[PDB]
Design an enzyme around this catalytic site. Structure first.
Site, PDB file in Angstrom:
ATOM      1  N   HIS B  38       0.808  -1.210   0.000  1.00 48.22           N
ATOM      2  CA  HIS B  38       0.000   0.000   0.000  1.00 48.22           C
ATOM      3  C   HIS B  38       0.847   1.268   0.000  1.00 48.22           C
ATOM      4  O   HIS B  38       0.350   2.344   0.346  1.00 48.22           O
ATOM      5  CB  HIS B  38      -1.000  -0.026   1.168  1.00 48.22           C
ATOM      6  CG  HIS B  38      -0.448   0.411   2.493  1.00 48.22           C
ATOM      7  ND1 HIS B  38      -0.330   1.737   2.856  1.00 48.22           N
ATOM      8  CD2 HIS B  38      -0.038  -0.308   3.563  1.00 48.22           C
ATOM      9  CE1 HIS B  38       0.163   1.815   4.078  1.00 48.22           C
ATOM     10  NE2 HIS B  38       0.350   0.587   4.529  1.00 48.22           N
ATOM     11  N   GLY B 140       4.580   6.726  10.463  1.00 44.06           N
ATOM     12  CA  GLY B 140       5.708   6.324   9.648  1.00 44.06           C
ATOM     13  C   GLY B 140       6.153   4.888   9.762  1.00 44.06           C
ATOM     14  O   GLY B 140       7.101   4.522   9.063  1.00 44.06           O
ATOM     15  N   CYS B 142       4.761   1.725   9.164  1.00 42.77           N
ATOM     16  CA  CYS B 142       4.558   0.600   8.256  1.00 42.77           C
ATOM     17  C   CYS B 142       5.897   0.101   7.719  1.00 42.77           C
ATOM     18  O   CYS B 142       6.873   0.851   7.630  1.00 42.77           O
ATOM     19  CB  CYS B 142       3.655   0.982   7.088  1.00 42.77           C
ATOM     20  SG  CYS B 142       2.114   1.721   7.515  1.00 42.77           S
TER      21      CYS B 142
END
Lengths: 298, 297
Positions: B38, B140, B142
């Site tokens: 993503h 931040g 991920c």
């Protein structure tokens, strides 16, 4: 809310094993010098009453078997700074990070690389208690493991582990070799003083719980500074000084709750308990989070 | 105390991945960079992305992979399921020995949480029954990974993707398969009711008796059927026979048979702990496995 240790990589690369006699423990390798606890040289017969100057003057450079994983490490010199043995070695450590040697004050937090025989076993975050001890996990063989903060490149080494105290708690020195506390690298009957709760830390932990959206412990009350101390003392909490008030100013202005109003909540929480509830996942008032830690990780 | 692994074999794998104006973490292992898929989505994209379609249009020069200062040039991109595999020009020198592993609920791992590629800190973690994991990250984080180490060897379990309204987190194994009934799409998802990990409470209680917290014992004994009926009404996962054999090593080293320890646990589920604590928690903590206990005792 999670107690978060520092990424231990920069320390991992400085951990060596140090042997002397039948004794083995860990050492810290920075820049051609190896730092370790000076009792590596006692026979544990010497432990009851050791003359360190006398035991050390009887040792040759070759009396120190130092290993860094695969390879031996020649000791070309050896001296003593207060309770830390400083070993001059043949080779400078190429993994030497950027560092400083800091002496922290009680209540402050840091991370610990627990090692065994020069092998890093794990990492964890703890705090220096008001009675100068560390509540931690140390099996027999953690002697020499180090405590640190990391800031940008810079590892702030603040603690080296020396002794288990009968209480079950841990005593050590700064990286210069001065003990934290009234403790001596000797086998006396030293007991840890009476522990107290780090009032300034639980307060900062309370702001975080509001910042993460919990308001149920607040109230309409406030308290003078002196009134708040005279109450918290009765629960074995550390006095709250004007310095502790100022430290909190940032976290106050961010939330809109005055620092003494926030002490009004701590008073109520101490008198009531939590009534089955929790706060950031604890059923206890957590004191191992400092104002700095709360500002960083929230 | 909760005890994370040494983190440095993983710190030297964390790189930054930018695509458009999302920037998150990636794992760099031998000329590939691993990453939540993503990253290739935007403001309006992720309300129902067709991921096969959004990626068949983009090319290597929409990905910015940076290892601190040195930029790695991307020379090929593919998906697996929800991991994005960016081929890069340079093989990682700090690549460690490693397996991709998929853990089970109630297992523990270490999270090396990072922000835009530089690592913040590490913590110890459990996979909950509802397949979420507790604590907090934010924007931040991920691409921050979970792992265990065995001998020389990093075993990667986890990759952070999502946060959810509960305040809890959602990720895949490193092959892009989700842990739990969650999707890498921005619409309304929720944890199921989480339960407490019964076998970790028992291993914890043993760790107490191993350190002389000896008072929650009784001279009594329930049995597997009578215990699980309690388990069901306090929302504890059932105890199995493999759960018992696992605890043998700890029952061996105490005198406390596993079912006896269960009677102790029941009278704490019923009465409570009644003022006292067990190793300084007022909670029956359940993010220590039987192995974790032994690994530290």
């Amino acid at each position: 809310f999670r107690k978060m240790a520092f990424p231990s990589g920069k320390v991992e690369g400085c951990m060596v094993q140090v042997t002397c006699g039948t004794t083995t423990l860990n050492g810290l390798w920075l820049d051609d010098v190896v730092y370790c606890p000076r009792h590596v040289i006692c026979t544990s017969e010497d432990m009851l009453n050791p003359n360190y100057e006398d035991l050390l003057i009887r040792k040759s450079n070759h009396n120190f078997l130092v290993q860094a994983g695969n390879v031996q490490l020649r000791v070309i010199g050896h001296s003593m700074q207060n309770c830390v043995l400083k070993l001059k070695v043949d080779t400078a450590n190429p993994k030497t990070p950027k560092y400083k040697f800091v002496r922290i004050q009680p209540g402050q937090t840091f991370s610990v690389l627990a090692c065994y025989n020069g092998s890093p076993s794990g990492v964890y975050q703890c705090a220096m208690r008001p009675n100068f001890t560390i509540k931690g996990s140390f099996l027999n063989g953690s002697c020499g493991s180090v405590g640190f903060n990391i800031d940008y490149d810079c590892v702030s080494f603040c603690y080296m582990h020396h002794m288990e105290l009968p209480t079950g708690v841990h005593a050590g020195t700064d990286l210069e070799g001065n003990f934290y506390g009234p403790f001596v690298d000797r086998q006396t009957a030293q007991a840890a003083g009476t522990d107290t709760t780090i009032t300034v830390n639980v307060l900062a932990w309370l702001y975080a719980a509001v910042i993460n959206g919990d308001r149920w412990f607040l109230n309409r009350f406030t308290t003078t500074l002196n009134d708040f101390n005279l109450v918290a003392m009765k629960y074995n909490y550390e006095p709250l000084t004007q310095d502790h008030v100022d430290i909190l100013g940032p976290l106050s202005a961010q939330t809109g709750i005055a620092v003494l109003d926030m002490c009004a909540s701590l008073k109520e929480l101490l008198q009531n308990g939590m009534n089955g509830r929790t706060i950031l996942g604890s059923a206890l008032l957590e004191d191992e989070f400092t104002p700095f830690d709360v500002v960083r990780q929230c």
